[PDB]
């Protein structure tokens, strides 16, 4: 399943939208499930992803106009059990044992994060944790040089492959690190 995850769109509260290379690379219809962490601030920011796919799920950020979003919701398709959270209740952002121990509280395997606006992801304690950053290039207090990058990912069976497209400057830097779910 080619699924596109995003987060922190900030439409139009910090920055506007994806770059021209990004909406080129992100055509509608190609995505199965869409997860937005938070900071969409509008309604058309959901409908812009609703043009891309029919399975679009957002939880509440902090800049959100919507009050209907539940905070945490466990979802599962196939062999993977995911929860979605924005990231503003993460005080502070970057503890090694916080994400290893929040995962086993509800017995998930793969975690998606946000609100930190900085790409950082690795493997720790039989689980893979993902922070994509800010998709539209919104500002964080910790990172001034904001680099927007999108992440499309693939689940077939108990082993994931990812494709991070780093737009460092104006050029697409494609990176890839393997992971196999136990």
């Amino acid at each position: 399943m080619l699924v596109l995850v995003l987060g922190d769109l900030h439409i139009p509260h910090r920055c506007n939208s994806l770059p021209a290379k990004f909406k080129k690379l992100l055509v509608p219809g190609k995505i199965q499930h869409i997860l937005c962490t938070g900071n969409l601030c509008t309604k058309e920011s959901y409908d812009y992803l609703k043009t891309l796919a029919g399975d679009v799920h957002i939880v509440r950020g902090d800049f959100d106009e919507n009050l209907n979003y539940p905070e945490q919701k466990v979802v599962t398709v196939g062999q993977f059990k995911i929860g979605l959270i924005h990231g503003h209740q993460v005080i502070p952002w970057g503890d090694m044992a916080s994400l290893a121990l929040l995962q086993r509280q509800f017995d998930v395997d793969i975690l998606i994060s946000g609100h930190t606006h900085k790409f950082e992801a690795f493997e720790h304690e039989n689980k893979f944790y993902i922070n994509p950053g800010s998709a539209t290039g919104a500002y964080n207090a910790l990172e001034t040089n904001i680099i927007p990058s999108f992440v499309l990912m693939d689940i077939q069976a108990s082993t994931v492959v990812t494709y991070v497209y780093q737009l460092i400057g104006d050029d697409v830097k494609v990176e890839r690190i393997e992971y196999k779910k136990s």
């Binding site: 139009p12 509260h13 910090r14 506007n16 509008t42 902090d62 503003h88 209740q89 005080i91 502070p92 503890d95 044992a97 916080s98 290893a100 121990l101 086993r104 509280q105 509800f106 017995d107 304690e125 207090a141 910790l142 001034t144």
Partner: protein
């Protein structure tokens, strides 16, 4: 209007100027035809104008090397911004102008112009104006003040004779969370705001002896067992005897969908707390 506010983003963008003052006088034309919009139109236009004035102050921070007035012109923004934030305090908005003040704390903080942080402490007072006595909803109390704690986690810019009164006043504001799990989670981060310390976790222990949900205070004990790791490693007896208490209490609670997952937490925390 709301679509106008997005086009105010276009007015930020298609009607910026690299000269910040030419942008500022047209920001004052954005005050003229557009910042004289009303009370909801100025609710719509002014925070992006403030976000423009944020970026204009960031353009002044981009004028850090080619301009010499940019700090004062960050301040010529700032007071004008603060009254424009106050122009939304006059516009029945206090909850959202916290955040712009919270950014105006950081816009004072990240730029560091002249007399920035006292006005940001005044903004902290303005935050304590616009938070500490109007929010009766406990959820809107929490996520404000913990982010304020989260910004006070990032407010190490205050020196150690100016850090403590807001550090108490947020702990004062952490007391207003009418549920103790809202309190203690803030209070645990109030212990994180110090960098004595561990007694505030025994206060959080006492908070965890005040809670009504018995596994949740043990989840808070788990959080305490999470919290007894950090400023320990950065207090030399408690962990394994309370791991013994999770060999104790996690038996004598619900063996539930949370708590057997919390058993699967604890077993994998046994995988974690075996630091090996």
């Amino acid at each position: 209007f709301a679509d106008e506010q997005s086009l105010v983003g276009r007015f930020i963008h298609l009607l910026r100027s690299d000269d910040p003052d030419q942008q500022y006088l047209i920001l004052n034309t954005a005050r003229k035809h557009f910042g004289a919009g009303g009370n909801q139109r100025i609710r719509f236009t002014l925070p992006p104008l403030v976000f423009a004035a944020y970026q204009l102050a960031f353009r002044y921070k981009e004028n850090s090397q080619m301009d010499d007035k940019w700090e004062k012109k960050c301040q010529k923004i700032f007071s004008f911004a603060h009254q424009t934030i106050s122009a939304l305090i006059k516009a029945e908005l206090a909850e959202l102008p916290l955040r712009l003040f919270l950014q105006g704390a950081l816009a004072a903080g990240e730029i560091g112009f002249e007399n920035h942080e006292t006005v940001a402490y005044e903004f902290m007072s303005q935050a304590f104006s616009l938070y500490e006595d109007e929010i009766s909803d406990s959820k809107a109390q929490l996520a404000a003040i913990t982010l304020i704690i989260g910004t006070f986690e990032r407010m190490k810019c205050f020196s150690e004779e100016n850090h403590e009164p807001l550090r108490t006043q947020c702990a004062l504001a952490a007391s207003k969370l009418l549920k103790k799990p809202d309190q203690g989670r803030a209070v645990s981060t109030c212990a994180h705001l110090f960098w004595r310390v561990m007694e505030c976790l025994k206060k959080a222990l006492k908070i965890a002896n005040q809670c009504m949900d018995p596994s949740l205070q043990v989840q808070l004990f788990i959080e305490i067992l999470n919290r007894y790791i950090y400023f320990y490693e950065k207090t030399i007896q408690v962990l394994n005897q309370l791991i013994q208490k999770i060999r104790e209490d996690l038996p004598n609670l619900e063996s539930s969908e949370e708590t057997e997952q919390i058993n699967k937490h604890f077993h994998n925390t046994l995988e974690h707390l075996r630091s090996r």
